[PDB]
């Protein structure tokens, strides 16, 4: 019923900018809090940012290694949230996931604490930052020339 | 009439006093429970200015106390030592056997002065002050309480 | 029961004074028993089938009625509420003549 | 600001066992934890919000418990689809840097499975480029621990190979491992016999698959 | 019930305030003082009752104490009433099926 | 559950809360009785040193009182006026409506001093202090009591 789609990921050189887009459908977008959470290949999950709804003022919060280089925005007429990345550093190479904090979980928070529970997660996008250019894959067949069951593969290199 | 909660098959409904359900079974007074629930649990503001703005002084209404058997752990409780500018006590001492609320993470102890224009301090929204297994309409001096309301249940057993 | 509160605590961290049974040794004696702070037992009840929130709502909807009761009585402390509810429960079924195959008679 | 620490880091249990993961907090927190299920390659899926509360659609075998600093996640009886990495995240304050735990990866236990072994020589089209990559395949084996050693003309080689492990299959709880060996064209055309030897608990004796250049 | 006490008093010299009406002495002004409102009686150990009763009291104490720990009543008078209520709920709390063990008909 | 005395013609049993005996008949609350029995009747030492060794001071435990309708005539009762060495009272005054035990042949009145290391004086064996139709967990000042325990009976 609820689905989120991330887009805009790609290769960017260290120090460059990049714009990520998050499309949402299946719920009330104008009343839900949005958040960006990234996962490094070897560092697990890391929270990036948070944006409130237009009801609570829509204040934005960022992470410590992230402040001053990223900027979050939202469009309620299109149910979309954008993340802008400037002065990017090599440590920000990660798989970025777009998450939503629905109005229903606002109702379960009773002590009125600012922290949120991440309800639904999207497919996520890949953001790679390295001092190298793109290279095409190499496809080579692996011939099967074993008994009743046999195995067959192909190899991709470089 | 006073409402009563019915829990059957992990479901809760108000017992209809007009209706008669012969399948309801009450085989012991142990199946009857009174429970205190904290206004905290409904999302009310717990900062001291809002809580004290929910309380007010009034004369002419005798206080009343009703027991309850089980309660909820509070994050925030309050304990008031308020005097008038002339030094006289605004709140009465805790009656015999009225002890503080037994489970508080934070006890907000407020001291100071006010006009205290009334013999007793009541909850402006009609809630109760929960003490050690006793709910009162009024605030007692120097005695930790939680803001709450009371429900009555028949447990399935 | 429709919960109409602004927010709800889905978790019920309950404390009570009913003993859980299997009292160890002679700890029931008041001299050797615990103090007033350690006579409680705790438990955690999660929100199942929307029960917990509803319970809170119930308490809310009870409050008014309860207050009226406390206005009528002159008891400084009222403990006989549950007992009275049980008495009314019995009177509801067996207060009058119990006619077989009747609506107000609970028989077989 | 707030530190979360999971335990254990890795876990291996059989189908139908009672599994319990612990999440510890640095500061005081009153049931703000949340348990997320993340299967490899997919997005994290919310299982538990606050304490002991199951999200609509989550099966009944999952259960939460605890308050304060320590929290417990319990699966009554494991099932094959429960193989995933689970995370605990606090919602008490505005999230800090260490708000998400490092994660606990659950692994399913089954009977010892003997690996099916195959070997693939480098292709002629790949030999045309000046680089050679021999493949050694060990599929359908549990547990994951296995020993792969390359021997060129009965000489053990090291530092020129790389291993790759596939995640646990969803239908049958069996792993797969691929060993890629990369050499130059000249050094590849310098020797006759090439063998990949493997040791595993499902085989009484370690087995070796070999071939000669241009064989049939 | 087997009395396992070191010794037992077989005789029960009991005093009570239960009513026995003689003249107009029931008016509090003309009534007796707090020392003369009691009536006495002597009940001997018959068929091993008395001693057993004493044992009962012993075996009751713990439970009673536990009850007094749970309640916050300074004085508890509604014990007999609650036991009567449980007595009625035990028989007529649920549907009374004719010719059943939990139905008295 | 509090044990309920089941009386028959020359029979006494504990009422089984699990079982239901339909032949048992309770047609009135007059058939329900609470009774106080004196530790005297169980053979306990009544000399002052042993009795006072059965009592001890403790703080933190609120006192509790339960009524009883009928009691036993005591040979030996006690009445304590104990102060601390500084002259302050060790025992609280009798609450309103708590009078002395109504039938005592000998009242052992003990006066003196002690450390009284606790807010209330309790019975170390968990027994009760029996007063005038009120049983307490604690000793009140200057108020004659008997040591005893409470039973509950249905009379036929
Ligand atoms: C069971 O649950 C129900 C539902 O939650 C409760 O109903 C609530 O009842 C209270 C009063 O009994 C309602 O409170 C009212 O709110 C209005 C709006 O709040 C303004 O003020 C606050 C505080 O400054 C602001 O934060 C907020 O943004 C709003 O600006 C007030 O207008 C009401 O008037 C009060 O204030 C004025 C000025 O001080 C006083 O002069 C008045 O006399 C009065 O005190 C009042 O505050 C509340 O809105 C109800 N809830 C809902 C959802 O409608 C029950 O109270 C509850 N029962 C129990 C026993 O707890
Ligand atoms: C209901 O009835 C029961 C049964 O009588 C009562 O239980 C008795 O409680 C008293 C408490 O003082 C016990 O008396 C003391 O017993 C000590 C140990 O002896 C017993 O216990 C061990 C361990 O279980 C047994 O192996 C042994 O056979 C005995 O049964 C004595 O050491 C005590 O002091 C003695 O020595 C000192 C010197 O240090 C003298 O000064 C004393 O006078 C005394 O001689 C004391 O005797 C009694 O034993 C218990 N009865 C039993 C266990 O059968 C309950 O208290 C009672 N409850 C109520 C509410 O009335």
* DSSP one-letter string for C60-101: HHHHHHHHHHHHH---SEE--HHHHHHHHHHHHHHSS---TT
3-state secondary structure of F70: strand
Nearest chain B residue to A109 by CA: give it.
B43
**Ligand 2 pocket residue status of E5, Cβ below 6 Å:** yes
**Ligand 2 pocket residue status of E61, Cβ below 6 Å:** yes
**E54-89 core/surface letters (b: 16 or more CB in 10 A; e: else):** bbbbbebbbbbbbbbbbbbbeebeebbbbbbbbbbb
The DSSP symbol for F93 reads B
Give how far B61 is from chain E: nearest CA, Å.
24
3-state secondary structure of E83: helix
Report CB contact under 8 Å: F124, C29. Answer: yes
Nearest chain F residue to E84 by CA: give it.
F29
Tokens for A47? Answer: 């929270």
Biggest alpha carbon distance in chain F? 63
Please give the helix or strand (H or E) that residue D9 lies within, else none.
none
- Cα–Cα distance between B85 and D80 in angstroms, integer? 72
Residue F92 burial (10 A CB sphere; 0-12, 13-18, 19+): middle
**Please, which residues bridge with residue A33 across strands?**
A101
Q: How many whole angstroms from its chain centre is CA C58?
A: 12
**Ligand 1 pocket residue status of B124, Cβ below 6 Å:** yes
**Ligand 2 pocket residue status of F126, Cβ below 6 Å:** yes
Residue E44 near chain F (CB below 8 Å): no
Residue E85 near chain F (CB below 8 Å): no
Report CB contact under 8 Å: B40, A110. Answer: yes
Nearest chain C residue to F60 by CA: give it.
C35
The label of the residue with tokens 């329900």 reads F32
Tokens for B31? Answer: 């199946």
Resolution, given in Å to one decimal, reads 4.1
- Cα–Cα distance between F68 and F130 in angstroms, integer? 9
- Cα–Cα distance between F148 and F156 in angstroms, integer? 25
The DSSP symbol for E67 reads H
Select from D135, D149, D79, D139 the least CA-distant residue to D113.
D139
- Judged by its nearest atom, the ligand closest to the C-alpha of residue C2 is 1
Please give the helix or strand (H or E) that residue C31 lies within, else none.
none
Q: Which of D49, D116, D139 sits opposite A117 (nearest CB)?
A: D49
Select from B135, B81, B68, B137 the least CA-distant residue to B107.
B81
- Ligand 1, atom 55: nearest CA belongs to which residue? B125
- Cα–Cα distance between B107 and E100 in angstroms, integer? 55
Looking from the CA of residue B128, the nearest atom of ligand 1 is: 60
Distance from Cα B54 to the centre of ligand 1, integer Å: 9
**Ligand 2 pocket residue status of F149, Cβ below 6 Å:** yes
Helices (H), B8-157: 48-53
Residue E14 near chain F (CB below 8 Å): yes
Give how far A26 is from chain C: nearest CA, Å.
23
- Cα–Cα distance between D206 and D186 in angstroms, integer? 30
Give how far E71 is from chain B: nearest CA, Å.
8
Phi, psi (deg, nearest 5) at residue E70? -75, -45
The DSSP symbol for D124 reads H
Report CB contact under 8 Å: C18, E70. Answer: yes
Tokens for F136? Answer: 């307490």
Find the helix packing angle between C81-94 and E79-92, rounded to 10°.
30
Q: Which residues from C are below 8 Å from A108, CB to CB? A: 7-10
- Sequence-distant (6+) residues with CB within 8 A of A11 are A128, A129, A130, A134
The strands making up A3-7's β-sheet, listed across from edge to edge, are A3-7, A18-25, A80-85, A70-75
Please give the helix or strand (H or E) that residue E56 lies within, else none.
helix E49-70
Q: Which residues from B are below 8 Å from E81, CB to CB? A: none
- Cα–Cα distance between A98 and B31 in angstroms, integer? 49
What is the full DSSP assignment across A26-66? SS-STTSEEEEEEEETTTEEEEEEEE--TTTT--EEE-TTT
Decide: D140 and D116 in contact? Cβ < 8 Å.
yes
Q: Which of F1, F17, F62 sits opposite B97 (nearest CB)?
A: F62
**F144-154 core/surface letters (b: 16 or more CB in 10 A; e: else):** bbbbbbbbbbb
**Ligand 2 pocket residue status of F43, Cβ below 6 Å:** no
Phi, psi (deg, nearest 5) at residue D185? -65, -45
- Judged by its nearest atom, the ligand closest to the C-alpha of residue F50 is 2
Report CB contact under 8 Å: B29, E93. Answer: no
The DSSP symbol for D31 reads S
Helices (H), chain A: 103-108
- Ligand 1, atom 44: nearest CA belongs to which residue? B124
Tokens for E19? Answer: 């009513």
Select from A2, A20, A28 the least CA-distant residue to A122.
A2
- Judged by its nearest atom, the ligand closest to the C-alpha of residue F37 is 2
Decide: D20 and D76 in contact? Cβ < 8 Å.
no
E-state strands within A65-124:
70-75, 80-85, 94-101, 120-121
- Sequence-distant (6+) residues with CB within 8 A of B144 are B77, B78, B79, B100, B101, B104, B107, B131
Report CB contact under 8 Å: D67, C13. Answer: yes
Residue D114: C-alpha distances to residues D201, D202, D204 (Å): 8, 4, 10
- Ligand 2, atom 12: nearest CA belongs to which residue? F125
Question: Per CB distance under 8 Å, which residues of B are interface residues toward D?
Answer: 75, 105
Decide: C5 and B43 in contact? Cβ < 8 Å.
yes
The DSSP symbol for B55 reads E
Distance from Cα C56 to the centre of ligand 1, integer Å: 18
Report CB contact under 8 Å: D53, C44. Answer: no
* Method of elucidation: X-ray
- Cα–Cα distance between D169 and F39 in angstroms, integer? 75
**D183-196 core/surface letters (b: 16 or more CB in 10 A; e: else):** beeeebeeeeebbb
**Ligand 1 pocket residue status of B82, Cβ below 6 Å:** no
- Cα–Cα distance between D171 and E95 in angstroms, integer? 52
Q: How many whole angstroms from its chain centre is CA F142?
A: 16
């Amino acid at each position: 019923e609820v689905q989120l789609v991330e887009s805009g990921g790609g290769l960017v050189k260290p120090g460059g900018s990049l714009r990520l887009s998050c499309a949402a459908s299946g719920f009330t977008f104008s009343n839900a809090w949005m958040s960006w959470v990234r996962q490094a290949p070897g560092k697990g999950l890391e929270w990036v940012g948070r944006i409130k709804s237009k009801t609570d003022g829509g204040t934005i919060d960022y992470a410590a290694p992230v402040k001053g280089r990223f900027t979050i925005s939202r469009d309620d007429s299109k149910n979309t949230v954008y993340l802008q990345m400037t002065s990017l550093k090599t440590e920000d190479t990660a798989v970025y996931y777009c998450t939503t904090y629905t109005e229903d979980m606002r109702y379960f928070d009773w002590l009125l604490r600012g922290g949120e529970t991440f309800d639904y997660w999207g497919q996520g996008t890949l953001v790679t930052v390295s001092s190298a250019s793109t290279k095409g894959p190499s496809v080579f067949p692996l011939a099967p020339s074993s008994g009743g069951t046999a195995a067959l593969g192909c190899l991709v290199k470089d | 009439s006073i409402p009563l909660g019915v829990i059957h098959n992990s479901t809760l409904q108000v017992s209809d006093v007009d209706k008669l359900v012969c399948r309801d079974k009450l085989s012991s007074t142990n199946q009857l429970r009174s429970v205190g629930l904290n206004l905290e649990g409904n999302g009310v503001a717990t900062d001291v200015p809002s809580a004290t703005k929910r309380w007010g002084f009034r004369s002419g209404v005798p206080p009343k106390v009703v027991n309850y058997e089980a309660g909820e752990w509070a994050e925030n409780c309050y304990n008031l030592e308020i005097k008038k500018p002339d030094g006289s006590e605004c709140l009465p001492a805790a009656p015999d056997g009225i002890r503080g609320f037994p489970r508080c993470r934070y006890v907000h102890k407020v001291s100071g002065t006010g006009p205290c224009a009334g013999d007793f301090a009541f909850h402006k929204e009609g809630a109760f002050f929960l003490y050690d297994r006793l709910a009162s309409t009024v605030i007692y001096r120097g005695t930790t309480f939680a803001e709450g309301v009371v429900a009555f249940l028949i447990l399935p057993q | 029961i429709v919960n109409a509160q602004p927010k709800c605590n889905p978790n019920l961290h309950y404390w009570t004074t009913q003993d859980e049974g299997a009292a160890i040794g002679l700890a029931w004696i008041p001299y050797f028993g615990p103090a007033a702070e350690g006579i409680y037992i705790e438990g955690l009840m999660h929100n199942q089938d929307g029960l917990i929130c509803g319970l809170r709502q119930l308490a809310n909807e009870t409050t008014q009625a309860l207050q009226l009761f406390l206005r009528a009585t002159t008891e400084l402390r009222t403990f006989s509420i549950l007992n009275r509810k049980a008495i009314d429960f019995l009177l509801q079924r067996w207060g009058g003549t119990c006619h077989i195959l009747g609506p107000d008679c609970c028989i077989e | 600001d707030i530190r979360l620490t999971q335990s254990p880091s890795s876990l291996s249990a059989s189908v139908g066992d009672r599994v319990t993961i612990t999440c510890r907090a640095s500061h005081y927190i009153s049931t703000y934890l949340n348990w997320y299920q993340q299967k490899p390659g997919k997005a994290p899926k919310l299982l538990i919000y606050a304490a002991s509360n199951l999200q609509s659609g989550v099966p009944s075998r999952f259960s939460g418990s605890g308050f304060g600093t320590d929290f417990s996640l319990t699966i009554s009886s494991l099932q094959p689809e429960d193989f995933a990495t689970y995370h605990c995240q606090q919602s008490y304050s505005t999230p800090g840097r260490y708000t998400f735990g490092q994660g606990t990866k659950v692994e399913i236990k089954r009977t010892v499975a003997a690996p099916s072994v195959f070997i693939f020589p480098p292709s002629d089209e790949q030999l045309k480029s000046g680089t050679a990559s021999v493949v050694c395949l060990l599929n359908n084996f549990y547990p994951r621990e296995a020993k792969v050693q390359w021997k060129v003309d009965n000489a053990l080689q090291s530092g020129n190979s790389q291993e790759s492990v596939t995640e646990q299959d969803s239908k049958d709880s069996t792993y797969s491992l691929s060993s890629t060996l990369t050499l130059s064209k000249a050094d590849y055309e310098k020797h006759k016999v090439y063998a990949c030897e493997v040791t595993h608990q499902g085989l009484r004796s370690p087995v070796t698959k070999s071939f000669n250049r241009g064989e049939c």
